[PDB]
């Protein structure tokens, strides 16, 4: 089912210029005769896209990173380019995504696949008997525990001229976003110098973690043809986009790039008049990230505060000092379940990055109805006569039911 037909002939990695390519509609809004701006994830202009060529069998597809989203372009004349596979380990023990273009249909699967090292489609009969043209998917060797399934009308495979197909993928908050365009190019060897919008195709509800990907080629003893594809990577960029007198985007410019485009952008115009203009101050980007915490080895007494055998009365509540210990509260996940947990002055999602000064723990036992009275600015007998919280309170309140330890028959 798997056959890796590779040849150990490495290959010097080529590069080429994507001048102004890869501009999509970053919304579903309609607009005419305007110059809208937008910070997003875009492909920056005059960038260094990597050129993969399928001619290298004479007398070749690797797994590539998926840093933040990619731009993908295919020339070719027939349809030697089928879908892609995306994931983080391209193995079992983790789910993965598969987009393939069989015949007369486009299928999409999320599952636990066991892809080959050189997955390909093998098609042979397009001539013989000119009928059947049986195929052969040598993609994976096991596919089980699938979650999503999609079979729809196929991708841009209608219709000398090469067919430039452009795609943009990005994985955001558990969705997969694919934008695409198809253009009948005439100039050989490279992506053209025009300007095309990328109308969106699909938004798949996937929810898997993607770091790497790979592309799947249709081979026709397997011969490969001489098409090519291009891969570029996305960065967070701010774009100035004008549309047209009837929707459809004619042009856009990318500030961060150059000192002139900054002025074109801040002017909100495509033309600059003779003169001298002030731009932003000279910025330097940080190269590294460092963390410096004190030398602390012990763990905090999570088991003699939350797992104690006897608590105090609320009128004579107990106060304990805590110091010199790492506050890794995840150890409370197996043995404790709290019905109330609320912090004031800090966010619960930030507690793991911080460092705390003058830590005290007050413990007592109350009725179930009075837990609402442990909060700043409350009234009632517990808050009036027994235990009062300051209005400028910083810290958390934790409470859990203990009917199994503090009640007798």
């Amino acid at each position, epitope marked *: 089912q798997c056959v890796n037909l590779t040849t150990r002939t490495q290959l010097p990695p080529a590069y080429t210029n994507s001048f102004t390519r890869g501009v999509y509609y970053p919304d579903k809004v309609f607009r005419s005769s305007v110059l809208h701006s937008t910070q997003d994830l875009f492909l920056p202009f005059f960038s260094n896209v990597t050129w993969f060529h399928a001619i290298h069998v004479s007398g070749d597809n690797p797994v590539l990173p998926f840093n933040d989203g990619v731009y993908f372009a295919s020339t070719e004349k027939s349809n030697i380019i089928r879908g892609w596979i995306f994931g983080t380990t391209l193995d079992s023990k983790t789910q993965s995504l598969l987009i393939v273009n069989n015949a007369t249909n486009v299928v999409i699967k999320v599952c636990e696949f066991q892809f080959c090292n050189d997955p390909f489609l093998g098609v042979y009969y397009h001539k013989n008997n000119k009928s059947w043209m049986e195929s052969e998917f040598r993609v994976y060797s*096991s596919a*089980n525990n699938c979650t999503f399934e999609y079979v729809s009308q196929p991708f841009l495979m209608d219709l000398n001229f090469k067919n430039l197909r452009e795609f943009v993928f990005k994985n955001i908050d558990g969705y997969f976003k694919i934008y695409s365009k198809h253009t009948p190019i005439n100039l050989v060897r490279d992506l053209p110098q025009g300007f095309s919008a990328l109308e969106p195709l699909v938004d798949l509800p996937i929810g898997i973690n993607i770091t790497r990907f790979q592309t799947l080629l249709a081979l026709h003893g397997w011969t490969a043809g001489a098409a090519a594809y291009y891969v570029g990577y996305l960065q967070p960029r701010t774009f100035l986009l004008k549309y047209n007198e009837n929707g459809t985007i004619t042009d856009a410019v990318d500030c961060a790039l150059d000192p002139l485009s900054e002025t074109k952008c801040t002017l909100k115009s495509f033309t600059v008049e003779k003169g001298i203009y002030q731009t932003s101050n000279f910025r330097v980007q940080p190269t590294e990230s460092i963390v410096r915490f004190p030398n602390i080895t012990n763990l905090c007494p999570f088991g003699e505060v939350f797992n104690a055998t006897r608590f105090a009365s609320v009128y004579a509540w107990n106060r304990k000092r805590i110091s010199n210990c790492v506050a890794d509260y995840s150890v409370l996940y197996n043995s404790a379940s709290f019905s109330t947990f609320k912090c004031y002055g800090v966010s619960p999602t930030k507690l793991n990055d911080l460092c705390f000064t003058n830590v005290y723990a007050d413990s007592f036992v109350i009725r179930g109805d009075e837990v609402r009275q442990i909060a700043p600015g409350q009234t009632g007998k517990i808050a009036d006569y027994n235990y009062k919280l300051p209005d400028d309170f910083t810290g958390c309140v934790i409470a859990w039911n203990s009917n199994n330890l503090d009640s007798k028959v």
Partner: antibody
Amino acid sequence: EVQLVESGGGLVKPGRSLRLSCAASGFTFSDYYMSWIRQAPGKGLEWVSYISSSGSTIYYADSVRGRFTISRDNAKNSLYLQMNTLRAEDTAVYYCARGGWELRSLAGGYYGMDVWGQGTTVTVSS
Amino acid sequence: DIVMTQTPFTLSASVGDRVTITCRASQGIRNDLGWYQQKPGKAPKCLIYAASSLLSGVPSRFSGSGSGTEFTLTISSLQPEDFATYYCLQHNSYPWTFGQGTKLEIKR
């Protein structure tokens, strides 16, 4: 889950015929080769028959060719053996097995003979 | 067709030690090999499906190594549920042909 059951076995005097049936549940039956596999008592495993989807490609064993006939029904999800002119060396436990996975489509499972039946005993004795 | 040969063929061992089974082939099969286990009275079940990959629900003491020919299954730290008869099957070309089995006995 996914399952294969058989029926039809028993005891047959030699020179007569029998028909084994096998019913599947939980697959896409048109995406897999099916197979019949015997096991003689006190011996090892040995394939008897293989059939592809739509019954075009059919493999028999050299010990059994010209006497046994496979058939499929993809609508009824069923597999057959018509066993004609039985002999005393056909006393065996028979198994329905799926191992196909049919390399033209996008199937599921593993590549191999992962799911099996439970066995049906055929005894030939005058 | 494609014939397979398993070399140990009634191997005997103690409990908690290493066990090797070798299975050869008469053509070039790439990685299409499965290892099957049959306890007496039951149906066989798959353990390794592409000469090195366990199935879901198989303990991680079985090991598969493979090439064009000369495949190997290894059981380290034997346990008393692992005493059965082990077959090797090729998945490369139809009809799919079995090996011969290897019963594994308990020392005494």
